[PDB]
Amino acid sequence: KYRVRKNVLHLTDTEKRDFVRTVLILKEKGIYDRYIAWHGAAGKFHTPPGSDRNAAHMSSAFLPWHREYLLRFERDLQSINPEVTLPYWEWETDAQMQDPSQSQIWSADFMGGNGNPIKDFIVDTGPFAAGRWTTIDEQGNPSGGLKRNFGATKEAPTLPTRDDVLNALKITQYDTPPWDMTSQNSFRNQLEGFINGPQLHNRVHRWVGGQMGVVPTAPNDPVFFLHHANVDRIWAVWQIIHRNQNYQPMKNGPFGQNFRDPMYPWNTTPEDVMNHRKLGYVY
């Protein structure tokens, strides 16, 4: 409970500077790429084979899978600069803004802006604009530049609200059988956003568009980690509020989705990361 992950809106210019710097270094080093691949690889690991469920989404392990993912990313960042921690994007507040693209999270000194429709929605502002930042497709090959198209779809014209975050936090069960895209009264499936979707998480990916718009390639965009830090935070909060509640399923769910099963592509299990304070950080 010593490294503290802050709200992006509360970062000092030098904090934003250092975060960007380090991710750039993590990118130059070839480490960042490992994270894009792990994500694409997990999505292709169906539990069980022939099912929608994959090691990282559309099932119970969604939350702990990405919590582990962020933990690893933060440690790698820390290896570069121990002063740096993963901030979180509180999109539910930006959603209150008239035009969310006005959020400081999209300023030229942090995440960069919306895509340029003159250049096929290629983002040309900020540290990650094309020419400074390389991207790779689902196949693992060069794709040619980050892309964004903020709220351009009929399905997700808006970012998720506070009420949405507050309504989800009211769910009494972590997840419910069958442990998938259809699970009812499920805080997990609710946060993932499949209920009358896209909501919350799925809705954020949809809103941003570009590579964030497709799960397998989402990580090419640094904001991805900031978005998942927010999701991880909302889950930490649920855990605090429901202390008699715990992870599910505990057993008899498909391999890779139970409390003590390994989470592909790793050996780490949901139990291993159930307690986030134990992981060394807080919000």
Candidates 10-18, 113-121, 140-148, 156-164 — which segment interacts with a second copy by CB under 8 A? 140-148
> Annotated binding site for Cu(2+), which residues?
39, 57, 66, 201, 205, 228
Query: 227 and 204 in contact (C-beta within 8 Å)?
Result: yes
Alpha-carbon distance of 183 to 103, in angstroms, equals: 34
In DSSP terms, which residues pair with 116 in a beta bridge? 122
Residue 157 found at the interface with a second copy (CB under 8 A): no
Residue 265 found at the interface with a second copy (CB under 8 A): yes
How far does the chain reach from its first CA to its final CA, in angstroms? Answer: 9
One of 6, 17, 21, 46 touching a second copy (CB under 8 A): 46
One of 19, 23, 26, 54 touching a second copy (CB under 8 A): 54
Q: Is 51 exposed, middle or buried (0-12, 13-18, 19+ CB in 10 A)?
A: middle
Q: List all residues 6 or more positions away from 93 whose beta carbon is below 8 Å from its beta carbon.
A: 9, 162
CB of 144 vs a second copy, minimal distance in Å: 10
CB of 78 vs a second copy, minimal distance in Å: 15
One of 12, 98, 139, 196 touching a second copy (CB under 8 A): 139
Query: 15 and 96 in contact (C-beta within 8 Å)?
Result: no
CB of 37 vs a second copy, minimal distance in Å: 5
Residue 52 found at the interface with a second copy (CB under 8 A): no
Dihedral angle over CA of 151, 37, 268, 47, nearest 10? 80
What is the Cα 1 distance to its own chain's centre?
Answer: 21
Residue 47 found at the interface with a second copy (CB under 8 A): yes
Residue 49 found at the interface with a second copy (CB under 8 A): yes
One of 19, 38, 106, 128 touching a second copy (CB under 8 A): 38
Alpha-carbon distance of 184 to 171, in angstroms, equals: 10
CB of 42 vs a second copy, minimal distance in Å: 9
Residue 269 found at the interface with a second copy (CB under 8 A): no
Candidates 27-35, 62-70, 187-195, 204-212 — which segment interacts with a second copy by CB under 8 A? 27-35
Half-sphere exposure of 35 (CA within 13 A, CB side): 27
Helix (H) or strand (E) segment spanning residue 187: helix 187-192
Q: Which residues bind a second copy (CB under 8 A)?
A: 29-31, 33-34, 37-38, 40-41, 44-50, 54, 134, 136, 139-142, 254-256, 261-262, 264-265
